Assembly symmetry: C3
Homo-oligomer: 339 residues x 3
């Protein structure tokens, strides 16, 4: 919803309301939990034409949880999702700074396409794989205008020293390259950064640096969407040992995400997917699976504004998992109004 | 404020700012407290025409308290009020899911009409009487188009297992019926649901199920508004014993709300009302009044956007109340800008 | 962004997104800290024409921090900044109530003009010098229409009894007078109020009343901005002893703020400034500086919607300060999109 269009500044206000329920057995041992998951989003996006070659922009978006009560748990899950401003110049590129997506999410975005679940390895406040605070990002499209379909990015992750180790990071750099051609895209992305002393001081995870890289292919044409991601992390992936009640990072993970979808004309969009992430060299455990499931789902788009969906996670994690990762299935049902 | 009207999607943005002060003596022993009560609301409402018989909709609304400081108490009282999405079909009815009003509020809404106070028995996160999270609601107007003025609803309350007993509920069903004719409306509504083990485990309240029902009449015509509600609850009404510092639910309550108002042409809207709610079979107390007052107030509407109001609670609760319910009067003064 | 203009009600929606980083050494001993400081604002402003002489208005504005994570620290720094409603009558004046600026901020606003820093003595939840909750404010412009440029205000501060002493206040009155002529403005403002028993009960600060006054001159013309504030506080200024880990108010402070700026045509706006605030008669310390720095900075306005800035604080606080006030420099870099 464009609330402003004058003298080359446009602002859009946008938002959505997501009625959502998760169904698991009893669901502390399930993939996604059990119960009401309703939530809403609000945000704006602005773009100003400063001169013929130079445009400025900003975006903000907030998540309000709607599955809390009015009492002490009222703001649980609320958060800024995005908040950044930048400048884009004719064929030089663009620069922005704020709370934005890590550059490795340029690869991991390929498979983050399921109705409700998926994108399990694109953690937030996790260096370069998801939403992080304090990233400057340089981006270039069509390689300075010289090569159509050829994009690249370089990102400086600023150190965030937070109270918990799970949410902290040190100084870091990363980058990405994508090519897109006749329906297809290929991408690679990499980032490395310091761990904070508090992260170091965790039982799980040993190393002075964190590292995350991923590659991906996708096909997005003829009503079809197909993608594959492969990824590898060192000292970077957050883990918890539910038996010993300890927390930290996986010394190494190996990540596979695959997704296949088809979009019917009349709005039905079936989906199948697979996610496996394996931890290795975990203090006191050795090797252990973090995520391992198949997904079957569908979204029904009535139009640009309304949709319903059901998302089934056939959970292949096993009951005797060494970290306590939950092994039960989850089904999500959702109804979305957005503008 | 309609920010979007195109191709049969309309979105409204709305909000208000409420400068508000409560005056009691000293006010921990008063009906409504003492001091600044300013707050603001923001929300949107969307409606999309999917086809000729089928419309989709969503609503979200947030409460920001404006009587906090910037420090540790900054978000106290903030909360999602509403957050839901649904579909309405030609003369079949409508379905929605999210954070919405309990179906018993279809009756209790009749008297929830005072400038500032009132609606004392339409508690939030209290099964079916007020705002609750995780309700699916089916609604039918004019009985499938067959009977003008005859409405009904059926609601499935999903279990919310929360950290506190005050805010939790189990699985539940409920419904309502209203008829509206030549200025008048009559209504009845009922709901029953499981109590969670944590609720069971409270000192106050004993029972495996919660139950809430109410009936009401109103007259809304010729500048007059008159309504009466009668209600009864079992194991459902939240109570606290301020002497023993314990909390739980009333085994039984009996509820009476009456309201009379007149709307002058030139914007003055005087009000009188009465609320009595009696607890029974309360562990360690037996019978005790929860709410017992008369109200005298007025709102001055300058127009659709601006109003002032004063709301006086002559508090009939007595100084020796057995639960510690406050017995002092309260006066609220308010100025409202809304859009 | 005006989202509504009809029948003499107008509403504006506004907001901004501030990508911001602070650079200090290591930065617990610095002026402004170290790291990501991104944040966003959203608000509305409404004005309704009730009749030819009487207009009603409301404003609300929220601060969302964008330099938090999604976990336990997600809402840190979030707060209502403003939230009030009122009425303005032809040449009688205006009245409003809510969370608004203390009347002494009518003087202190003169120098609160730096890119990022400054306004150091206009604390929030501090009686009359900054944002406070529960103020009624009467305002008059051009002295009932009789004297152009001559404005005055009187403000009733309502008691806020909060959990902490830092954020509380008692009942209070205050006022201000300004004259504005041929480019210049002069102003004086004063307020006094009760301290709460909890404030009294603090180690730092002794007195039954709080008092704050300030005067100011400014010049705002020919692309130049120059201002000076002088201020004095008794029992009102919040202080902490980082050595003894105690908190309270300064028995007396003396405050000086000066600012000089020039606005180039092509959008560059250099700045220099000075702030000194001295505490006196501080229990266990005697006299000690709270703030003492020089500022050098600049903002580049690309247009009404986009700007960049850099703000350097040459910190003159000394390493051996008796309260533990940080003595290191800070540099802020910022990029702003606003609408
Ligand atoms: Zn994201
Ligand atoms: Zn409600
Ligand atoms: Zn302010």
């Amino acid at each position: 919803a464009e609330i402003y269009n004058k003298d080359g500044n446009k602002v859009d206000l946008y938002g959505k309301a997501v009625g959502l329920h998760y169904f698991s057995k009893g669901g502390e041992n399930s993939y996604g939990g059990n119960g009401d998951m309703t939530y809403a989003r609000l945000g704006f996006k602005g773009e100003t034409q400063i001169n013929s070659d130079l445009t400025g922009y900003g975006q903000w978006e907030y998540n309000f949880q709607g599955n809390n009560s009015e009492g002490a748990d009222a703001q649980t899950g609320n958060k800024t999702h995005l908040a950044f401003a930048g400048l884009k110049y004719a064929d030089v590129g663009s620069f922005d700074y704020g709370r934005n997506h890590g550059v490795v999410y340029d690869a991991l975005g390929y498979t983050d396409m399921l109705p409700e679940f998926g994108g399990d390895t694109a953690y937030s406040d996790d260096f370069f794989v998801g939403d992080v605070g304090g990233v400057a990002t340089y981006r270039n499209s069509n390689f300075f205008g010289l090569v159509d379909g050829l994009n690249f990015a370089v990102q400086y992750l600023g150190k965030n020293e937070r109270d918990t180790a799970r949410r902290s990071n040190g100084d870091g750099v990363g980058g990405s390259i994508s090519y897109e051609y006749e329906g297809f895209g290929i991408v690679g992305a990499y980032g490395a950064a310091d761990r904070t002393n508090l992260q170091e001081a965790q039982p799980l995870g040993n190393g002075k640096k964190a590292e995350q890289w991923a590659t991906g292919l996708k096909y997005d044409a003829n009503n079809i969407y197909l993608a594959a991601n492969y990824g590898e992390t060192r000292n970077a992936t957050p883990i918890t040992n539910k038996f010993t009640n300890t927390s930290g990072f996986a010394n190494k993970t190996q990540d596979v995400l695959l997704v296949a979808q088809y979009q019917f004309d009349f709005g039905l969009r079936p989906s199948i997917a697979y996610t496996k992430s394996k931890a290795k060299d975990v203090e006191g455990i050795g090797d252990v699976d973090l995520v391992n499931y198949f997904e079957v789902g569908a979204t029904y788009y009535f139009n640009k504004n309304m949709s319903t969906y059901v998302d089934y996670i056939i959970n292949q994690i096993d009951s005797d998992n060494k970290l306590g990762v939950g092994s039960d299935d989850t089904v999500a049902v959702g109804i979305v109004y957005q503008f």
